[PDB]
Nucleic acid binder design. Structure first.
Ligand code: SF4
Ligand SMILES: [Mg+2]
Ligand SMILES: [Mg+2]
Ligand SMILES: [Mg+2]
Ligand SMILES: [Mg+2]
Ligand SMILES: [Mg+2]
Ligand SMILES: [Mg+2]
Ligand SMILES: [Mg+2]
Ligand SMILES: [Mg+2]
Ligand SMILES: [Mg+2]
Ligand SMILES: [Mg+2]
Ligand SMILES: [Mg+2]
Ligand SMILES: [Mg+2]
Ligand SMILES: [Mg+2]
Ligand SMILES: [Mg+2]
Ligand SMILES: [Mg+2]
Ligand SMILES: [Mg+2]
Ligand SMILES: [Mg+2]
Ligand SMILES: [Mg+2]
Ligand SMILES: [Mg+2]
Ligand SMILES: [Mg+2]
Ligand SMILES: [Mg+2]
Ligand SMILES: [Mg+2]
Ligand SMILES: [Mg+2]
Ligand SMILES: [Mg+2]
Ligand SMILES: [Mg+2]
Ligand SMILES: [Mg+2]
Ligand SMILES: [Mg+2]
Ligand SMILES: [Mg+2]
Ligand SMILES: [Mg+2]
Ligand SMILES: [Mg+2]
Ligand SMILES: [Mg+2]
Ligand SMILES: [Mg+2]
Ligand SMILES: [Mg+2]
Ligand SMILES: [Mg+2]
Ligand SMILES: [Mg+2]
Ligand SMILES: [Mg+2]
Ligand SMILES: [Mg+2]
Ligand SMILES: [Mg+2]
Ligand SMILES: [Mg+2]
Ligand SMILES: [Mg+2]
Ligand SMILES: [Mg+2]
Ligand SMILES: [Mg+2]
Ligand SMILES: [Mg+2]
Ligand SMILES: [Mg+2]
Ligand SMILES: [Mg+2]
Ligand SMILES: [Mg+2]
Ligand SMILES: [Mg+2]
Ligand SMILES: [Mg+2]
Ligand SMILES: [Mg+2]
Ligand SMILES: [Mg+2]
Ligand SMILES: [Mg+2]
Ligand SMILES: [Mg+2]
Ligand SMILES: [Mg+2]
Ligand SMILES: [Mg+2]
Ligand SMILES: [Mg+2]
Ligand SMILES: [Mg+2]
Ligand SMILES: [Mg+2]
Ligand SMILES: [Mg+2]
Ligand SMILES: [Mg+2]
Ligand SMILES: [Mg+2]
Ligand SMILES: [Mg+2]
Ligand SMILES: [Mg+2]
Ligand SMILES: [Mg+2]
Ligand SMILES: [Mg+2]
Ligand SMILES: [Mg+2]
Ligand SMILES: [Mg+2]
Ligand SMILES: [Mg+2]
Ligand SMILES: [Mg+2]
Ligand SMILES: [Mg+2]
Ligand SMILES: [Mg+2]
Ligand SMILES: [Mg+2]
Ligand SMILES: [Mg+2]
Ligand SMILES: [Mg+2]
Ligand SMILES: [Mg+2]
Ligand SMILES: [Mg+2]
Ligand SMILES: [Mg+2]
Ligand SMILES: [Mg+2]
Ligand SMILES: [Mg+2]
Ligand SMILES: [Mg+2]
Ligand SMILES: [Mg+2]
Ligand SMILES: [Mg+2]
Ligand SMILES: [Mg+2]
Ligand SMILES: [Mg+2]
Ligand SMILES: [Mg+2]
Ligand SMILES: [Mg+2]
Ligand SMILES: [Mg+2]
Ligand SMILES: [Mg+2]
Ligand SMILES: [Mg+2]
Ligand SMILES: [Mg+2]
Ligand SMILES: [Mg+2]
Ligand SMILES: [Mg+2]
Ligand SMILES: [Mg+2]
Ligand SMILES: [Mg+2]
Ligand SMILES: [Mg+2]
Ligand SMILES: [Mg+2]
Ligand SMILES: [Mg+2]
Ligand SMILES: [Mg+2]
Ligand SMILES: [Mg+2]
Ligand SMILES: [Mg+2]
Lengths: 82, 208, 121, 95, 99
RNA sequence: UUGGAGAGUUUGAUCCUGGCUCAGGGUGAACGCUGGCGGCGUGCCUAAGACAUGCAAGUCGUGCGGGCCGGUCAGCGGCGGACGGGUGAGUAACGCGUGGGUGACCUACCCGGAAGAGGGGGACAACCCGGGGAAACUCGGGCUAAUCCCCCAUGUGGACCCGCCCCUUGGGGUGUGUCCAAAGGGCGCCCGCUUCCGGAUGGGCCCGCGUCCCAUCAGCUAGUUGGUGGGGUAAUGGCCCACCAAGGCGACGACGGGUAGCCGGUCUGAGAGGAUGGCCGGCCACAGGGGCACUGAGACACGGGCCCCACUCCUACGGGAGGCAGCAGUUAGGAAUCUUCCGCAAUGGGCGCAAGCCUGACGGAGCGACGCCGCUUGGAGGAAGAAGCCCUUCGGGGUGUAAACUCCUGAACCCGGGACGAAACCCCCGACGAGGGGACUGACGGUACCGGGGUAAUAGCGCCGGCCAACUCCGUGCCAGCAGCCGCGGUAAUACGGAGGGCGCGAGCGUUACCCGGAUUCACUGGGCGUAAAGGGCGUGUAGGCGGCCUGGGGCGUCCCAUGUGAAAGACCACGGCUCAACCGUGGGGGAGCGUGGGAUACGCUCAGGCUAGACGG
């Protein structure tokens, strides 16, 4: 099924994740349906986490299942906030 | 890494004084004031007419040996300057003048670019507080260059700043001898550098 | 030609020819010496040039020049050959590499030692 | 050395079940078409009803796809109606 | 949208099928001159209304057979035997090209 | 307007034409000499040759009955195994690219909505007993559970025939007739089950345009081309079959032969163009060589099955086992390409309510100057200038501030400290919701880094006749040898070998191979044909290419506007993180082509009406 997850970019010992929506059978660094956010786990920048809230809401509404880390990041960005 | 052999022979070959030694360059025993001909067995024979390629090569080698930079780094800097918007000769001269070792040589913390390289490499220089140990670091306008707080009580540094209390730095720089700290105001102008170099010759050399 | 003639026929590209076909696309080839001898050059040069007949791993059998003063090659010596013809010798298109397999380096060589395969003294 | 052996065993059992069901479907369809060709309309529709019920199941499972079952039913009903039209009067069911 | 082409009927020897000759122009990619090319399409003609010389429009459709993926949409004009004559003369000239 | 260099060589000398050669850049490189540190990338291009050994896909006891001592083992039953990983053999093709179509189609798990979940029956494993077999395994008798199988009922609904209506390729409604549902488990909920509609994702099929060389390959085709009926499929279709007609394709290059995975991109180039497709992302094909189907939502399935062939192994000779183009590794071939490493801590994936389990994907470490980037082998002072070596006009000149020598700093080393990457799932409250509180978890790694001590600490390679930067001595004597071209060498060689000196680069420097450039030397940009290579021996003429003046219509080419597409990465610009850089992150802009809607009509095209300067006739 469609999932909202993290695709790894960057370089060795320097991970930079993209929060993307894609089919679950695609390899993790392959082509995705669209891109909604980004994450820097090392937090080397003032803005180390961005999420498209409206697009994430849309994709959640149509049955996309986030991963644990993706769900945590979406909650930090305030996607599930009511 | 870099050239670590005899250095006055470079001046004698280029036919001009490249101040690559410091105090001895202004002394009467400067090798360009005693034997102003090229080194080797045939240095005192009448010179033949130099070809165009020879002229451009000698001008480029003079410019490169003034700053003591390898040819790979020199050419990379030249191509970078050619990519930038702005007159490529002036941009290239500014990029060369923004190297940390050259900047601390001009500020007066050293008497030669070689000594400035050893100062920067050995962890005696700080840029904006944090310590930098890389000669190739490129200083941007506004950056503060200074001697490390624990390096202020160093005899070589003390003498260097003593001998500069009278000398005045260029317009593109500011120095505080009491504060033991410099400031890089702007990119140096082409007229502010007393360089015996025609940069058009260097550009034409790299067009080949 | 007219534009219509160019549309009908076009311009023919130029096809280059290999000068080292026995190398079969490789930079070097290993071979075994069958005949070692000396040959005489064409006009105006005069010499006795040392060559070897080499049967290669690629299936061809060619003639290769032996550079440098003095050599230890003989029948059944294993050698490496590289491209490059010898101008004044007819039919010689390849050079033996000194210092590889059974071809020793040039003895007492002091200049240009990376060629001729001589170690630093 | 794996769990592929279990898959092969189960596949053989499912193959037996699917073959049995499809054979029964084919036999019933042929019987209904022949009876309609006789015409002989009363028993032809009863056999056709049996064939239709045996087509709709096991289209509930992996034996037949729904579209395949629909096509089977459509072809059978069309052939039966054509043959009975070539014959005389109709009977109950299947109309 | 479904592609619509315009052409002239050059063959109607098959049942319920017409051969339509479609022409297109394009500049040469490197030499720039505008050039003409033609292509034949087998088109479904169930009612057999269109005959030799008809200029018609055909539209991309569900496969009717092999080689038959277009349907005649409408008639554009009639009485165009000159285009057919050009095609037939070009075809006839091939007999003298052999060895 | 960011962008463009030429030289040597045909002559006694000259101009031109023209070939050859060179100076630049690049590579999955290789070979020679040399070799200190780190970061980031990258490493079988050949035999798609053959492979020892270990690992690379399992999981569920909250579906079920069991043997064994809360576990363990196997069995039945689900889901996964069609993804992920590898390779480039085949393929010149709707395979790929780009834009579209499907009233001709499928889609497990996920999400939303509607409705339902009633009753009855049964079998096969496991298991207990006999056999057969060397083994691999296999047969018979009997028992038994389920979310296993079957039947009946019910019909929110849906499937089929036949009508009817609208719509128009098989789309959507409606009427009689016929047919089709289901399963439980855990502590009132939760996880599950059945029918249908919708969404989202992922696919099948079809079409326009583009997609290499040879015409000394010119004709090809008989399921061939079309039609009718049928079979098969999720679905169109000669896909397959029976019958009827005689068609289909081709110089705009059919057919045949050779070669080749294709693209985003990459290298080169002033651009146009040329070459190329390693790594990374997308698609396709293949899994010892061939064929085939089964199961399944999905395969004709790399670590599933069957058969034939080659090969390897067991042997009681009847029979049986196997497939590294997964990760390492071996062997063969080759000029040439690595560890039988660590860990699931991160991200992703399968199963499971969960705990968790599995994951050679992946995150990391190792090896190789294979590439790029950064760094070190010291800094200052120091003789009209030691010794050695080389040259000399015998006065001297050079190596050379170079050395020695004094002062300074402090890579390696030592001691101590010490990471980020990891906050979730989990539990408590709240209502297992939203929202708050708490805890566990590090392979890399005692690594990066930080603080305090600390020694003067690798340099080599090519070249020095012209092109082309850098010259003298000795040795040899058409020999030895050098050579990219022109050419050097035959007793006074700046061209061979050595030495002193010099030039260029520098942990590298050269050489070979291949590609672009220079080559305006296939000339679209941007060449030519009297005598340099080049006008067909001459007519007539087919296809094709091109075409006079004026008026109107169309708006196909052409141009403009809006909109969709032109993925990500790469290229450009700006900002930012690693002490800089390489490298990486964020944002912005471009961009040929193609679809759609609108507009313009000068030119080309096309239709219509005129004119006589071209052409023809009297
Ligand atoms: S002393 Fe004179 S010759 Fe020597 S390096 Fe200084 S300026 Fe050059
Ligand atoms: Mg002309
Ligand atoms: Mg000679
Ligand atoms: Mg040398
Ligand atoms: Mg299982
Ligand atoms: Mg039967
Ligand atoms: Mg199925
Ligand atoms: Mg079916
Ligand atoms: Mg065409
Ligand atoms: Mg066309
Ligand atoms: Mg038809
Ligand atoms: Mg013939
Ligand atoms: Mg000559
Ligand atoms: Mg020339
Ligand atoms: Mg002549
Ligand atoms: Mg001459
Ligand atoms: Mg090497
Ligand atoms: Mg070492
Ligand atoms: Mg490394
Ligand atoms: Mg390979
Ligand atoms: Mg494992
Ligand atoms: Mg895969
Ligand atoms: Mg291939
Ligand atoms: Mg191939
Ligand atoms: Mg092939
Ligand atoms: Mg072919
Ligand atoms: Mg297409
Ligand atoms: Mg497309
Ligand atoms: Mg029973
Ligand atoms: Mg017994
Ligand atoms: Mg039994
Ligand atoms: Mg029994
Ligand atoms: Mg069931
Ligand atoms: Mg029923
Ligand atoms: Mg290509
Ligand atoms: Mg037939
Ligand atoms: Mg056929
Ligand atoms: Mg056909
Ligand atoms: Mg492209
Ligand atoms: Mg460019
Ligand atoms: Mg370009
Ligand atoms: Mg490829
Ligand atoms: Mg393929
Ligand atoms: Mg194969
Ligand atoms: Mg094999
Ligand atoms: Mg399934
Ligand atoms: Mg099936
Ligand atoms: Mg397959
Ligand atoms: Mg298989
Ligand atoms: Mg499999
Ligand atoms: Mg395998
Ligand atoms: Mg079978
Ligand atoms: Mg066999
Ligand atoms: Mg026996
Ligand atoms: Mg392997
Ligand atoms: Mg392979
Ligand atoms: Mg091998
Ligand atoms: Mg070899
Ligand atoms: Mg070998
Ligand atoms: Mg290699
Ligand atoms: Mg994991
Ligand atoms: Mg996980
Ligand atoms: Mg395992
Ligand atoms: Mg490693
Ligand atoms: Mg480097
Ligand atoms: Mg010194
Ligand atoms: Mg941490
Ligand atoms: Mg420590
Ligand atoms: Mg310290
Ligand atoms: Mg010179
Ligand atoms: Mg010579
Ligand atoms: Mg030499
Ligand atoms: Mg001599
Ligand atoms: Mg030379
Ligand atoms: Mg010499
Ligand atoms: Mg260039
Ligand atoms: Mg030229
Ligand atoms: Mg060209
Ligand atoms: Mg040119
Ligand atoms: Mg031209
Ligand atoms: Mg010419
Ligand atoms: Mg002429
Ligand atoms: Mg002329
Ligand atoms: Mg003549
Ligand atoms: Mg010519
Ligand atoms: Mg002539
Ligand atoms: Mg003539
Ligand atoms: Mg002639
Ligand atoms: Mg004549
Ligand atoms: Mg004619
Ligand atoms: Mg004529
Ligand atoms: Mg003629
Ligand atoms: Mg004509
Ligand atoms: Mg138009
Ligand atoms: Mg893009
Ligand atoms: Mg920065
Ligand atoms: Mg970006
Ligand atoms: Mg439009
Ligand atoms: Mg006109
Ligand atoms: Mg007219």
């Amino acid at each position: 099924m469609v999932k909202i997850r993290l695709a790894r970019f960057g370089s060795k010992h320097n991970p930079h994740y993209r929060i993307v929506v894609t089919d679950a059978r695609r390899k993790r660094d392959g082509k995705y349906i669209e891109k909604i956010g980004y994450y820097d786990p090392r937090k080397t920048t003032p803005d180390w986490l961005k999420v498209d809230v409206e697009r994430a809401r849309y994709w959640l509404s149509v049955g996309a299942q986030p991963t644990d880390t993706a769900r945590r990041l979406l909650r930090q960005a305030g996607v599930f906030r009511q | 890494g870099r050239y670590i052999g005899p250095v006055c022979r470079l001046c004698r070959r280029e036919g001009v004084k490249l101040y690559l030694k410091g105090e001895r360059c202004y002394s009467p025993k400067c090798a360009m004031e005693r034997r102003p001909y090229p080194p080797g067995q045939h240095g005192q024979k009448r010179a033949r007419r130099p070809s165009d390629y020879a002229v451009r090569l000698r001008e480029k080698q003079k410019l490169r040996r003034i700053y003591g930079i390898s040819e790979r780094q020199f050419r990379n800097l030249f191509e970078e300057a050619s990519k930038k918007k702005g007159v490529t000769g002036s941009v290239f001269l500014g990029l060369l003048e923004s190297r940390l070792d050259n900047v601390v040589y001009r500020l007066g913390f050293a008497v030669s670019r070689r000594q400035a390289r050893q100062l920067v490499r050995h962890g005696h220089i700080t840029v904006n507080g944090r310590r930098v140990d890389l000669p190739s670091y490129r200083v941007r306008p506004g950056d503060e260059i200074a001697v490390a707080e624990k390096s202020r009580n160093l005899e070589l540094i003390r003498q260097n700043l003593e001998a500069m209390k009278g000398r005045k730095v260029g317009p593109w720089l500011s120095l505080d001898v009491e504060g033991m700290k410099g400031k890089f105001l702007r990119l140096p102008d082409r007229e502010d550098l007393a360089l015996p170099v025609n940069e058009q010759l260097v550009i034409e050399f790299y067009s080949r | 030609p007219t534009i219509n003639q160019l549309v009908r026929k076009g311009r023919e590209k130029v096809r280059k020819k290999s000068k080292v076909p026995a190398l079969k696309g490789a930079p070097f080839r290993r071979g075994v010496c069958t005949v070692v001898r000396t040959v005489t050059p064409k006009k105006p040069n005069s010499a006795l040039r040392k060559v070897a007949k080499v049967r290669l791993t690629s299936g061809y059998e060619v003639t290769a020049y032996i550079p440098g003063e003095g050599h230890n090659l003989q029948e059944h010596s294993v050698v490496l050959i590289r491209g490059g013809r010898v101008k004044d010798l007819p039919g010689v298109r390849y050079h033996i590499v000194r210092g590889v397999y059974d071809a020793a380096g040039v003895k007492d060589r002091k200049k240009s030692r990376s060629k001729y395969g001589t170690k630093k003294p | 050395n794996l769990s592929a052996l279990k898959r092969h065993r189960q596949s053989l059992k499912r193959r037996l079940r699917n073959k049995a069901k499809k054979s029964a479907i084919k036999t019933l369809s042929k019987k209904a078409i022949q009876l309609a060709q006789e015409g002989k309309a009363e028993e032809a529709l009863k056999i056709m009803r049996k064939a239709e019920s045996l087509i709709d199941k096991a289209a509930k499972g992996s034996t037949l796809h729904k579209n395949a079952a629909a096509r089977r039913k459509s072809r059978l009903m069309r052939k039966v109606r054509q043959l009975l039209e070539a014959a005389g009067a109709p009977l109950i069911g299947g109309g | 949208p479904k592609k619509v082409l315009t052409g002239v009927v050059v063959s109607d020897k098959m049942q319920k099928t017409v051969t339509v000759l479609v022409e297109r122009q394009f500049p040469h990619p490197l030499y720039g001159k505008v050039i003409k090319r033609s292509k034949k399409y087998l088109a479904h003609d169930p009612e057999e209304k269109y005959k030799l010389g008809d200029v018609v429009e055909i539209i991309e459709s569900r496969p009717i057979s092999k080689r038959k993926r277009f349907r005649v949409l409408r008639l554009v004009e009639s009485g165009r035997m000159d285009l057919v004559e050009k095609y037939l003369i070009r075809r006839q000239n091939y007999e003298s090209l052999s060895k």
